[PDB]
Design a protein around this ligand. Sequence first.
Ligand SMILES: [Ca+2]
Ligand SMILES: [Mn+2]
Ligand SMILES: [Mn+2]
Length: 306
Amino acid sequence: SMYVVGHKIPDSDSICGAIALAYLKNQIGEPAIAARLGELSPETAFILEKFGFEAPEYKTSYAGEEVYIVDHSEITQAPDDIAQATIVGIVDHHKLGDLTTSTPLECWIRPVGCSNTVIKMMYDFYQVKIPANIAGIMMCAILSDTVIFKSPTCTTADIRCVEALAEIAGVEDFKEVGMDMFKVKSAVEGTPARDLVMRDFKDFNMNGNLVGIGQLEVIDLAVFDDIKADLEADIAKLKVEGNRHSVLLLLTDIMKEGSEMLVVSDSADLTERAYGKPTVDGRVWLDGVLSRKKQVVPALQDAFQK
Ligand SMILES: [Ca+2]
Ligand SMILES: [Mn+2]
Ligand SMILES: [Mn+2]
């Protein structure tokens, strides 16, 4: 069988996409097993529970196996031993990264806000009906990725596809299911600082400099008030533990549609150079900022070249 698998530190898109593409492949006689490279966030765990699904199989070694990649095309986000596997498919909505194959494959890549939007196109192409349970987690993955359409990564294709999936899943109020997800993401009390920093954390090599960026998306930025000092202490620790130039944590308020960024950097004027807004006691408010890959990373990469 093939293993359908998303990126290291799986998000809803990577997990819901794996289940959604595995089902499709099994229905068209191309045997497939959903898999993951890490634990589910409470967000993803809630989505699976609500629509009645088991987590994909936890699997880290793929040497000698067939692999269908979801929601990236990067070596670093792939399984450690991806070079010893055979990539038979990629479905994604990112820039084309450094993954390569020695064998013919499928690529379904589109400039949209969510892999699950593309996977919906795959069902239509194959003329396989989307079961109500699958439609719902597919829906939720797109609301997760596009932040209920508020993220500037949201495209026309994502909106029309959610509207389509909502009817198939018999969800009347897709926006209420979206807010239900971000409420679960907003329940941060009692969670160790490190679990929160690493929930959605990525390392970047920006012109020789190692820059780590976490992000939490919540309904109200006030939930972080009592734990914020523990966060600032833990991003200092983590900067040392990895010998990082910079560790930044995005606290993203999806109602104000902005991000408070906690900063520890070897560069004192980092946020002044990249965004034209300086940090004040290792903190800066970034109005309108929702997306790491669109509004945060480009401007940092530009400042490490300059
Ligand atoms: Ca390539
Ligand atoms: Mn993702
Ligand atoms: Mn995605």
